[PDB]
Amino acid sequence: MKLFRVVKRGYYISYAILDNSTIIRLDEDPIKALMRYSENKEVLGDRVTGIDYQSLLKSFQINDIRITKPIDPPEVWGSGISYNVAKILGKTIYEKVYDAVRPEIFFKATPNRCVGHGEAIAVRSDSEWTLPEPELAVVLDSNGKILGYTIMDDVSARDLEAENPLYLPQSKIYAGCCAFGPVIVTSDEIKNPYSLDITLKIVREGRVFFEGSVNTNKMRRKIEEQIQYLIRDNPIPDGTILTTGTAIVPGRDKGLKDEDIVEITISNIGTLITPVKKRRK
Amino acid sequence: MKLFRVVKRGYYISYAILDNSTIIRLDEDPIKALMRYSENKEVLGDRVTGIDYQSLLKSFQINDIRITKPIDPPEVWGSGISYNVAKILGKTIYEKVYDAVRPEIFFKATPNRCVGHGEAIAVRSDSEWTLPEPELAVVLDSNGKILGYTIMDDVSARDLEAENPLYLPQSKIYAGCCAFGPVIVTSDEIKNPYSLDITLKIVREGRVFFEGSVNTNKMRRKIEEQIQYLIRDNPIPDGTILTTGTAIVPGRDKGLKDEDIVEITISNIGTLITPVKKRRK
Amino acid sequence: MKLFRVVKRGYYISYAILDNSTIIRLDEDPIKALMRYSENKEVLGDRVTGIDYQSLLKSFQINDIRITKPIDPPEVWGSGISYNVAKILGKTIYEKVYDAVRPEIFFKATPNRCVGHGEAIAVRSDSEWTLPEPELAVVLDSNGKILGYTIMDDVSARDLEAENPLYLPQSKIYAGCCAFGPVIVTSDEIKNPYSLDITLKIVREGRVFFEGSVNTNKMRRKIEEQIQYLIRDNPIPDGTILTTGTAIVPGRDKGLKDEDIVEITISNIGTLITPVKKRRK
Amino acid sequence: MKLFRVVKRGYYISYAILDNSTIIRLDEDPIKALMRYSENKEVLGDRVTGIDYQSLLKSFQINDIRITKPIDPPEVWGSGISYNVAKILGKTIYEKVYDAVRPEIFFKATPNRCVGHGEAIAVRSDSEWTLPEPELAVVLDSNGKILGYTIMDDVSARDLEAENPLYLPQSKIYAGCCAFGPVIVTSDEIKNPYSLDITLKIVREGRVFFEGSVNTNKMRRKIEEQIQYLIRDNPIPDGTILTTGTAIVPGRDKGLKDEDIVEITISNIGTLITPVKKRRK
Ligand SMILES: O=CCCC(=O)C(=O)O
Numbered sequence A, B, C, D: 001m002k003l004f005r006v007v008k009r010g011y012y013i014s015y016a017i018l019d020n021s022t023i024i025r026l027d028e029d030p031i032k033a034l035m036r037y038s039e040n041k042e043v044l045g046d047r048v049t050g051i052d053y054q055s056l057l058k059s060f061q062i063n064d065i066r067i068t069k070p071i072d073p074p075e076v077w078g079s080g081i082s083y084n085v086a087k088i089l090g091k092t093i094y095e096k097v098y099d100a101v102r103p104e105i106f107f108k109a110t111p112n113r114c115v116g117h118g119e120a121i122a123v124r125s126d127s128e129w130t131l132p133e134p135e136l137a138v139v140l141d142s143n144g145k146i147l148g149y150t151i152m153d154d155v156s157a158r159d160l161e162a163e164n165p166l167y168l169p170q171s172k173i174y175a176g177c178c179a180f181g182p183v184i185v186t187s188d189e190i191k192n193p194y195s196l197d198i199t200l201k202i203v204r205e206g207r208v209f210f211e212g213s214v215n216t217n218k219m220r221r222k223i224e225e226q227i228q229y230l231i232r233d234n235p236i237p238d239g240t241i242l243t244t245g246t247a248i249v250p251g252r253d254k255g256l257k258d259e260d261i262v263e264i265t266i267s268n269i270g271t272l273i274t275p276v277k278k279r280r281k
């Protein structure tokens, strides 16, 4: 099942698409729905027609409905390094985390700092080099069970971070610092999570300013281990998103700018598209 | 005005004490109440008797009422360094932040990871050296206006941090990682914020295991500046707590242990007391 | 448009059927929906398939959905005589009301005393002669504007009434004293309200125990006048039902009994069917 | 305990006075509170000072608080005759009810048609002779257990009724047709319900236009019996008011008029005062 959500005259309506192109309008809250599905694959709702999922993907709105975040995730958390700066004993903090038993885990966002397909991501007013970070993300219940997968953009102000790692939070958490969607796919829609293509394109005035790709079979730090360290002594709410870290990193000249289009593709999920918007002083 | 809150048969009731020892039961939500006060000092409620604030402070419960967090703060954020590790060009990341224009700001907690007076703080199952960090904290509205002050304990797993700064989040954010109270005092209850005594005591089986004190006149990074960087491109909800960083740091042999009592005193606020509880595997 | 409602695992879902047999799942509350329609005929929802209105009519349930009252009407009111007992000066109270400027208006039910298609109506434990009263009913807004029409059964303990008119309330108001449905049709679905056939059948063990019919062109007291006296100094909530009085009255030997089936048909609306259930002592 | 309620800036606050003049602010909903009390006399709340019950009684408002209905009763029901018109076989319908096994019971009001101490009762635009009916009233739970007592004014358009008993509903049910308060007293505050004085005064421009009194020891139809017929096959919600019928009836020249003051006194309860307001066309 593939879950999405629209905003229609101030209210949400959630839908699920089945493999056979049939759309179900959801009865339940979508987080609640995902949970039921991971139990017995049962789905409460009515089959609808006249809902053009394919058009929504391309055009974002259609009459009085607009696509958006598939769920409001109570908490978003990130993983780091799963594929002239700070060093401990001539070893770089990043390569140290790469070896150590303990993976990097950071707080990414609250739901109101996230955005969805066809909404704008943001570049901090004071960031000189902000990069999108294309990542596989998992939707979790409170026991760290995987309720499904989605594309996330861990938008990061890389310049503020390289300046000092103690700025990582400021570099990671702010309005529009995070985008995800356009769907959440259920666990069975992905036979093997370590075998999917992730592809970033940046588009400047029609111009392909950056392109790059990589496969999840090149992920060192396994997802279960990331989940284990996330939840250790740390209770998470149902519907939490964990973003598993990126493997595609543009150069220092590829910083984002106002009006750019960021497009991210993951196999079996779809393509997340977000305009970029530079904030002001 | 000094605001506190109790839990009585599954429900909250908020009270305010006025300088003249008269207790008002609150009509409004306490965050909403704080906002009104910072506008015109008006307070909606009834004068109550038979509510023993002084006993509550000492004994935590009394009949069917128990003191707790004075508010549920939608977000808690921390400030760092306002008074053999990682270094950028032979300069330590901490001393670099100390000089730079940009202060350290980190995400501390969500409301359900916080606790109050007479409730237990926690030591991560996998932390070998967790220290309490006694700090002045401010309650904010969405424009970063100061609605009031309180004592906070930024409980931190210092060993996980010194191991690698990329572990700072894991070291800072977990169930019981944060305590505050026992009251929130309104802005006028503190004539000069840079002139107050902060005092930490740790108590092990009746034994004063650690004691230390310092005055806020020794704070380098001013509060307004911390607030400014917090809110920059980063929208905060009403009732957010910013904890302004600690100046009292026990040695490496002073790690917390199960059943310890942590007591923190700040002038004009009161004394926050929390048992400690080591988590398991 | 023709509105109905089902109960599915403890929750309601409202649907509307359009003349062309297409079913819309409702976005809004159905009372709210009716109001919008009487303004501009606009309907907020999604076209559904797999909802078998025609089967629901016949079989009441289907999988996990069951038909019921089309709305919860905040108030139900009745009209009387619009087509050896009590007399004022040798004139019978009923024939007096028939002549007078002022029509009879009585309080009929609250929503929890009403029932719908395929649910049981009730006969008071202490009633010896209870008759169903088949009537055209109107759904009203607070200004007494007609939002639509439906079939109502003003179930009445005629024996308690004929004994004394001061017992009329006891005779009219009790659990299961009132049934309506199976749809509410919008005002435009009925070109002329004074030109419709009403037909009562009572069914005892398969046996047609009573049958009778009449046309609304034989209604003396016009609906607008009934509405006018209802709302005079008497504010009604949105979604109130006014039942306009009956013209079909079985004899004294036709009292209802446990397990009877009451079936009522009105042109363009449909057929309301309710088992009967005698209460106990 | 004696329960009352005020309206303060758009919100309710309920209070209870104990015999010893101490006022408790209520924790619970007041209907819920009454129920608890009838179980074990336990009361959840805080003792308040600065709430001038005695002034509220006299002056209705005080600063930003105003007295009103003590509860919102989901349903109000009335009893009749418990102490040239319509006749069955030369016997008057009223004297027939007086003898019969079955008492009169009628639907009186919904909560939004009721008003309280110091609010205006209404006279129907089209009523020529409306009388107040001073009555003892009981607050009920769903099993018809008596949760307490209060004064009610069954305001009745006697002229519309005497014209035809089928107009009784129109005569009884309309905006402002019903007033009650100023308190609800708990069952133990009244040792013997059949031993209390009820006193009506009507006041026209300072002038005592009517006065009269009677004692409940002159009530024929006992309360339990009224309750029994009320609840028979007729489920009532918690907090229902049953008004037990009046024994004080002014003459045909004593019809109410705009600006009158109606004052009703019942022993151990208090004095209900309501201005009168004639409605228009
Ligand atoms: O700088 C630490 C964050 C690393 C990260 O976000 C990633 O690898 O995706």
Ligand SMILES: O=CCCC(=O)C(=O)O
Pocket: B078, B079, B080, B081, B082, B133, B135, B154, B161, B168, B244, B245, B246, B247
């Ligand atoms: O390690 C960074 C946090 C510093 C801090 O919390 C403080 O100074 O209070």
Ligand SMILES: O=CCCC(=O)C(=O)O
Pocket: C078, C079, C080, C081, C082, C133, C135, C154, C161, C168, C244, C245, C246, C247
């Ligand atoms: O007895 C009065 C009620 C009359 C009535 O309900 C009707 O005519 O439908």
Ligand SMILES: O=CCCC(=O)C(=O)O
Pocket: D078, D079, D080, D081, D082, D133, D135, D154, D161, D168, D244, D245, D246, D247
């Ligand atoms: O006319 C019937 C109502 C009688 C009544 O309300 C009373 O006796 O109080």
Ligand SMILES: [Mg+2]
Pocket: A078, A079, A080, A133, A135, A154, A245, A246
């Ligand atoms: Mg990342």
Ligand SMILES: [Mg+2]
Pocket: B078, B079, B080, B133, B135, B154, B245, B246
């Ligand atoms: Mg700190």
Ligand SMILES: [Mg+2]
Pocket: C078, C079, C080, C133, C135, C154, C245, C246
């Ligand atoms: Mg009828």
Ligand SMILES: [Mg+2]
Pocket: D078, D079, D080, D133, D135, D154, D245, D246
């Ligand atoms: Mg009466």
